[PDB]
Each structure stands twice: as structure tokens, then as C-alpha cells.
Ligand binder design. Sequence first.
Ligand SMILES: [Mg+2]
Ligand SMILES: [Mg+2]
Ligand SMILES: [Mg+2]
Ligand SMILES: [Mg+2]
Ligand SMILES: [Mg+2]
Ligand SMILES: [Mg+2]
Ligand SMILES: [Mg+2]
Ligand SMILES: [Mg+2]
Ligand SMILES: [Mg+2]
Ligand SMILES: [Mg+2]
Ligand SMILES: [Mg+2]
Ligand SMILES: [Mg+2]
Ligand SMILES: [Mg+2]
Ligand SMILES: [Mg+2]
Ligand SMILES: [Mg+2]
Ligand SMILES: [Mg+2]
Ligand SMILES: [Mg+2]
Ligand SMILES: [Zn+2]
Lengths: 99, 83, 66, 98, 239, 101, 90
Amino acid sequence: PFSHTKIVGPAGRYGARYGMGIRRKVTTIEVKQRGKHRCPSCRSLVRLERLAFGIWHCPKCGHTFAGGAYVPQTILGKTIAPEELKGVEAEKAKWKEAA
Amino acid sequence: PRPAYRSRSLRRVKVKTPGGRTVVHYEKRAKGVPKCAVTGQPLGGMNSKVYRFGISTRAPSRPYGGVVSHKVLARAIRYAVRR
Amino acid sequence: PKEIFLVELWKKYGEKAQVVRVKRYEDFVKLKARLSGYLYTIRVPPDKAEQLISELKAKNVKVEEV
Amino acid sequence: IDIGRELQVAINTGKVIIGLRETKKSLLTGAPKLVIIAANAPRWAREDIEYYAKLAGVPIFTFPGSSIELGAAAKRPHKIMALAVVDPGQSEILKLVE
Amino acid sequence: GKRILVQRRGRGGSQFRSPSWKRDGPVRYPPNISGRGIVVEILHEPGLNAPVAKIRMENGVEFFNYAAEGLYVGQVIQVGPDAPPAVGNVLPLGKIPEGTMVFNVEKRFGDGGKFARSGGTYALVIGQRPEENKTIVRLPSGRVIEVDARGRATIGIVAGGGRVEKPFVKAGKKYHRARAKSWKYPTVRGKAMSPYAHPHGGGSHQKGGTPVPKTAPPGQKVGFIGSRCTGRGCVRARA
Amino acid sequence: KVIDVGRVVVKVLGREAGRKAVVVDIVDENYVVITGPKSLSGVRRRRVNINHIEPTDKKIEIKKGASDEEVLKALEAAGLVEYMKERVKPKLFEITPADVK
Amino acid sequence: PLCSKWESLITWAEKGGNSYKALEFREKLVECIVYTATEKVKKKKLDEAEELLKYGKEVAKKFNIEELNFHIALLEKEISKIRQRRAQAQ
RNA sequence: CGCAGGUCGCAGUGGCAAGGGGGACCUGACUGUUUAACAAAAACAUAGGUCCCCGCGAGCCCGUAAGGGUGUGUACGGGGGC
RNA sequence: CCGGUCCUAAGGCGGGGCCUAAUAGGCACCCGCCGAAAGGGAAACGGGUUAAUAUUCCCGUGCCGCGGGGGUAGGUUCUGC
Ligand SMILES: [Mg+2]
Ligand SMILES: [Mg+2]
Ligand SMILES: [Mg+2]
Ligand SMILES: [Mg+2]
Ligand SMILES: [Mg+2]
Ligand SMILES: [Mg+2]
Ligand SMILES: [Mg+2]
Ligand SMILES: [Mg+2]
Ligand SMILES: [Mg+2]
Ligand SMILES: [Mg+2]
Ligand SMILES: [Mg+2]
Ligand SMILES: [Mg+2]
Ligand SMILES: [Mg+2]
Ligand SMILES: [Mg+2]
Ligand SMILES: [Mg+2]
Ligand SMILES: [Mg+2]
Ligand SMILES: [Mg+2]
Ligand SMILES: [Zn+2]
């Protein structure tokens, strides 16, 4: 599943310390943090740069925005997003409703 | 003097003198170049290395000079034209 | 000290020189105008060199062989 | 109406211009018929298109997807912010204006 | 001597104080902002619990606000009564539709914002009482309180949620976070002490303390301080 | 076509950025010849890249290859000789790096 | 070429009637050629140096500069001795 | 870096430099700290768990007072126990 | 032209004010200042010399800041190419 490990992939830097449960939590969060995300503006599948916690930057379109601590968009945050970036979905409705 | 040379604020340069010796000269590092006020990148025509303050740096022949790059200036003028 | 390559430009400095020094080599001669601010040096062909010393002596500029 | 299928027809039959920079050139210096801009286009690219289109008297259709889905609708493997349909070779892509 | 650590904290020694020079300023509403502004920066602030946004107002005032989730550099926000209830906009509590998610709520107008200021926290606008000019909102703890309807709050939820979900895996990781905060790190248990140093210190088998009353004096007011109850039964009694 | 002979344009790049001019010739697709008269607005008569100018909504009537004096009578006919004297003032504080990425 | 910026400045200066600046630009043009060529010979990059020296010959003809011709002759003589010693050992 | 051949000693990482190893129980998870001058530990801390006081004009603490710390903070928080 | 001297940091002091039986005691407020010979920060290098100083003296070649003179580009309603 991972490059050189079976289950402890991102958290393999910790070795055999800190406990399986603690390291397992790190693997769960870190896999989404270090995965591929869609930029909320350009919708590219790109590895966003996390400047700090809650600060994300898209290397393609340069979009800098506030998100989750380790993931660019939390579950609740994905519903209260600004509607300026909800233009594709808005026109998607107006194509369907008008046709 | 001496502990002011044990810090890395100056550059330790070794040079061989005409008298045959090798001595260490302590010189200043360069000052940072001017940056744009929007993107923060270095500005063309004003980014040559300068080591002391008080030296005039001739800005490029454009409105707003060494304040913003050509990209910010041209785009802003486009907005002002339509606005 | 500054170096100049055109004799026309160097003549403007060398004419005002307090002293013109001369250093001679096989292929060229070094002419050094000592002004109050800088020392201006030009490397000229040997045939050009004795010519330049001539008028500078006519301009009353001191010419000293180093 | 299939926007993509007509665009493929207009891509292969008539003249379609791909890319934002070509579109601005074709709006500014040429005479296009229909401009298509992706819905998720940035503010500077959107407002440049409408202003030149408003001056040029050329209509604009906002594609109901993003730049990526616009490129997929035109069969291209890349993104497409905006395109100009200069000639609808066999397609009915000009129906989108109404 | 004999004074306990909680009594020594009140003296304001350097190891108990906030290094607030590491930050650019308070995250508060200026009292006189209205109109349109631009999100010019999004910054990490040491010791804070959320990313911070810098707003360049149209008239020229720049202030600091906690960034709502989804706020981006170059965004245009609306401030004032005439603003719409979009995410990132700063509005009065009177003009917020009910059921909206808000943060940095002002209890009274002009204090700069008091509630819902940590990452991932929000306040829900529950109701309106325009006759007395109050807005009923539910704070992040679940408490329902009335605030000034003229006061200002931001639309959305505070960015940076899930930060406490990730463990502080090493003691060194919590060490570095303590230096940007005011906490004394680390902490010695009371019963690991001697009787001169803590009420719990002492005996050959050291023990904790039973709860103290609410009237207990300083130096005796440690452990459970007039608690309604303890343990799992207290959690059940609350529900 | 917007960039056409008789169109008032604002030059955006170079030393003459922000100044006003009028297209008098068309070289090719990539180039046109602008001249807002140098006595009037400050722009010398030369070719300009069409990407380095911003068209305005104001246009006048002059034939191709129009002389500099012809544009002056045309703009005074439109009463735009004062409009050609102003220079465009940008608002750099409204710009963010997203606009120039 | 490497010193083309100095060529354009000379014609611009002479076109505007700046005889003083044209002389200063003429000196800079000769400095750009002799200095860059003389550094290449010291590093013994004769292929790079000869390309600069050939360009310097054109510029002196195009601008009537004898001092380029005198200094280019000195640099070509040095190039001959460097190439001669290389052939001897190799 | 490799291959082939020859060859000397008791000894070829020839001096210098330079891990003895394995099984099992108790115990503290671990790195870390500690009685300067008889105790380095199984003691302290620790990450993790949990409980309590608190919506800020709070809670807890310092000061005779003026006032102050937590606080350029706000429950994904401050303080207090285990 | 090497350092201090200048700047501010964490901090501190003084006056006013408030507090205090009172001060030589306290400081949230206002005003000023102090606070780094390792942070920021103008400008000098090589050679020679003494029993003992040496980027300080002497030689040579420079640099910085402040001010002045001449020439020059420029300006002289208005804009440098
Ligand atoms: Mg220093
Ligand atoms: Mg430095
Ligand atoms: Mg601390
Ligand atoms: Mg003990
Ligand atoms: Mg007791
Ligand atoms: Mg006791
Ligand atoms: Mg006990
Ligand atoms: Mg040994
Ligand atoms: Mg241990
Ligand atoms: Mg250990
Ligand atoms: Mg001991
Ligand atoms: Mg011992
Ligand atoms: Mg223990
Ligand atoms: Mg456990
Ligand atoms: Mg218990
Ligand atoms: Mg000082
Ligand atoms: Mg001595
Ligand atoms: Zn993006």
C-alpha cells in the first residue's frame, strides 16, 4: 500500500515508539494531508502546499486560502464555502433547469 | 572587534597579500534588493548586489518605477480604464 | 586608479595631470596621468608612446620615467 | 443540446480557437462568432473577456463546467479557460447564444 | 518557601507570562469599519489557535481578523449593515438570518469580538429580539446567551479545525508549542511534592485531595474547587 | 474588431504606460501603429504590440494611415482633446497576486 | 554579440548629438571586448576568445577604432604562444 | 572497483585505532530530568486518558491600595486535580 | 574610514498622575530618555618602520559624509531620449 511499508507508511519515521494506536492516528491524518487535493479555485488534482495549519496554497493557480488544520477542507467547512467559488455548480443548475 | 568576528554577520574572506601573507578580511553581506509590493519578488533593473546603504539605485523608466513590477502596473491600468 | 583605452579620452585627463609617469615594455608603454583624484593609465603602442610624450611636454605637463 | 458533441463537430469541421490568449487576440483583432468561457475562470480572465466582448459585440456563453471539463468536452487532454468559435463547420454550436 | 505554584503564577513572573511580542497585534474588530475590503494576507500567528487574515479596507484601514474557512487572498468582503450574509463578511448580529454560522461574536458593540475565536469553532444565531436589541446565539460550549444586536460577527466557521485531533506525539512537540503560549511546561503533580509545597504532598503513600469548598482561601484552593460532583456520575448528572 | 483604426487606446507597458493614444495604422495581427500626438498626450508615433495597449470604449472616424494633425481635428470634433490629456491612475492597493499569476 | 549593447548606445548617442557620451560609450565598447577577451585567454579558452576577437575586428572597422586593433593584435600573439606550447607538449 | 599469477611470516583492520555474545524474570513504555559535595533510581517529567471551575464584567492568582498576571487570549480556550 | 559613539530588543529609569500615615515604597496611564565593544548599522587597503604602537606613524593607492567652485547633460509657460 505504501512505498516501502505495509501499514505504518507516513508514520514510519517514528520507528517502534509511541504505541500502535498513537502511530495509527498519525497515519490516518497524514495520508489525507500528504495526498492529492483538488484546488477549490482551479479544481486541479495537485499536492497543495500547507504553509501553516489552516493555510493552504495551490502551486498551479496560486490560490491561497484558509482551510482545515491538516486537510484543506473540513467536512463542515465544505458546506460553508464562499459562493464566489461556487460558480461552476451554480451555472450547472442553470444549464439543467433551462434545458 | 573580536566577538563581532566570531558571529556570522560578516563574511570571512581569505586573501593572499602582495607581501606573501594570507589574511582574513571581514566584509559585509549585501543588502536585500527592492521587492514588489504585491508579489514580493525582486524587481528587474534594480536587483544588482549592493553592500552599503545610501547608494542611489536608478529605477526603470516606467510610471511607479521600482514600486511594482510591470505585471501589477499594466493590470492595474487595465482596471482603471474600465472602472 | 582607472584604465582608459582611447587616447582621445585619455588626452583629456593626461593634459591636466600634475605628473605623467611612463613605464616601458616591448610591445606597449604604460602612460599614467596622476591627477588629484585618480591615476589614469593607458597602454599604447611604442610608436604612439613617444608621440604622446612629445605634445605633453609641449603642454608643460611633467613627464617622469618610472 | 450537447455542448461538447457540437464543439467536437465545430472543432473538426469549422474553426475553433483554443486558449485564453488566442481568444483575446481573436476578440481584439479578429471577428469571432461565439466565445465560451469556463465557469471557474479567474476574475481577471473573466472580466477581460466580457469587456473586450462587450466592445466587440460578440456574445459570451459560460460553460456549465470548469476549465478541465471544458477541455474534456472539446476532447482535449488539457484545460481550456476560453475558446472562440470562428466557424461552426457542421455544428449547431451557435444555438447556445439564445 | 511555602507558597504553592498557583499562588506564584499571579505575580506575573516571566515563566508565566504571554510572549505577545511574537504576534503582529490583537485580532479584534476596529470600532469604525464599514464598506468593502480586500483579504490581502493570510498568516500564521505564534500562540494563536487559528490562521489570521489581514483586511485592507476600501478607505484604507487595515485590521486583523480570524480567517473563516474558505477565505482566500484577494477576496472581497463586505462590512456593515448593508453587507450580505456571505462567508467572510462582517455584519451586525441584528442583520444575521437565524440558523447562520458565525464567529468572533461581540458581546457588546465595539469590544472587538469575544466568542468563537478558536480554530473550527463557530456560533449559531438562534433567535432575534429586536425590541430589546439582543440576538440569541449558541456559543461553542453550547451555552445560549444574548448579545448586542448592534455588535458585529463574521460569517462562517473559524479555519484550522481538527488541529487538536492530531496527537502531540512527543514531549518535544508540546514543548515548542508552550514557548509561543503562556503555559508553564511541564507540570508536577501535587502529590509528588512535599507537604510544604502542596496540600496533596506528604505521606508515605501520597494521595490526592477531596474537594474544597467555594469559600476556600488561596493556597488551599487547589484540586477540585467546589465541584458539583466528580467522576462519571457527574457526567451523567449533567445529561 | 475592437483594435481598429480610429480607436482610443491606453498604453499599459513601457515608459509611455498609462498614456492615451489613437490607432492610425494596422501592421499585422500582432502589431498596430498608434499615435496619440506627442504634443497632446505624450506618445510618439510608432508601432505598438496590441497586447501592450488597452482599448477604450471611445472611437473616432479617421482613414487608414491618418496623419497626426488629422487625429487632432478628429478628437477636437469629438471634444476629446482634454480626454487625451489625462493619464490613467491605477489603484495598486486593489491588486492581489491572484490577479497577476 | 556580447558587446552589442554598447554598439546600440553609440549610434543612439551620436544620433542625439551627444559627442561626449558617444566617446564614453566608445570606450565602454572597447573595454567590453578587450576585458572579456583578455579574461578568456588567461583561462585559456581560446575558442571562446577568438570568437570575441573576430567580433572586435568587425567593430573597429564599423566604428574606426585603432585601439581595438592594437589590443587585438596583442591578444592574438598570446593565443599563438599558448597554442604553440600546447602542440609541443601534446 | 575487479581479475589473474607469484610470494613471506607465529601473526597481514600485524603498530595506532577497534562491539564479547545468548536465554529468562521484575520494573519504568520510550528520548528527557534529579539530591553542586556519600543516593541517577523502580524517583520526577512525558505523550495519551479522564474529571472539575469557567461565556469573559468569567474562573483561578498577585497587590495595602492604585491596580496587575492568565490576556495582543475566548471553550479545538484559561486555570485546577488524578 | 578599527571599535564605542547612533538604533531598537527583552527590559529599565525619571517627571506628571493615581496610590500611600509617609517616603528613599507601587505603576495600569501620559511624556522623555536609557538599554547590545557578538543583533541592525557610512567609509582603507598593501608595503615599510620601533626596544616596546601599527588598518592609528611613514609611503603608495583609495573610500565615506558634509559644504563650496568650475565644466557638462539639462532647465529657463510646458514636457528628458
Ligand atoms: Mg554589529
Ligand atoms: Mg546581518
Ligand atoms: Mg513561557
Ligand atoms: Mg520526594
Ligand atoms: Mg487542607
Ligand atoms: Mg499546608
Ligand atoms: Mg497526603
Ligand atoms: Mg590501544
Ligand atoms: Mg525511563
Ligand atoms: Mg535515559
Ligand atoms: Mg550527591
Ligand atoms: Mg553517585
Ligand atoms: Mg512517575
Ligand atoms: Mg494508557
Ligand atoms: Mg482518584
Ligand atoms: Mg542607546
Ligand atoms: Mg606588540
Ligand atoms: Zn488552484
